[PDB]
């Protein structure tokens, strides 16, 4: 009751980690998924909508080393 509370938010600790992961795939899955989960300290629900949302956003931003 009342548990699962609201404790996830996203700045340059977590940015920084997903950040690396894009420059070395665009397409990631159950494999590295599960070791990203350890990485960013929370649950992997986060996890799925940030890859959603980063490609319509990422129009043109996703050149890989500038």
Same mark, same amino acid.
């Given at each position: 009751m009342k548990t699962t509370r609201v404790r996830t938010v996203?700045? #340059?600790?977590?940015?920084?980690?997903?950040?690396?992961?894009?420059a070395a795939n665009p397409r990631p899955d159950a494999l590295m998924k599960e070791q990203?989960? #350890?990485?960013?300290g929370l649950?992997?629900?986060?996890?799925?909508?940030?890859?959603?949302?980063k490609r319509?956003?990422?129009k043109k931003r996703s050149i890989m080393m500038k």
């Open positions: 996203l700045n #340059e600790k977590q940015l920084h980690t997903l950040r690396t992961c894009y990203l989960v #350890e990485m960013t649950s992997p629900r986060v996890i799925r909508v940030w890859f959603q949302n319509c956003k990422d």
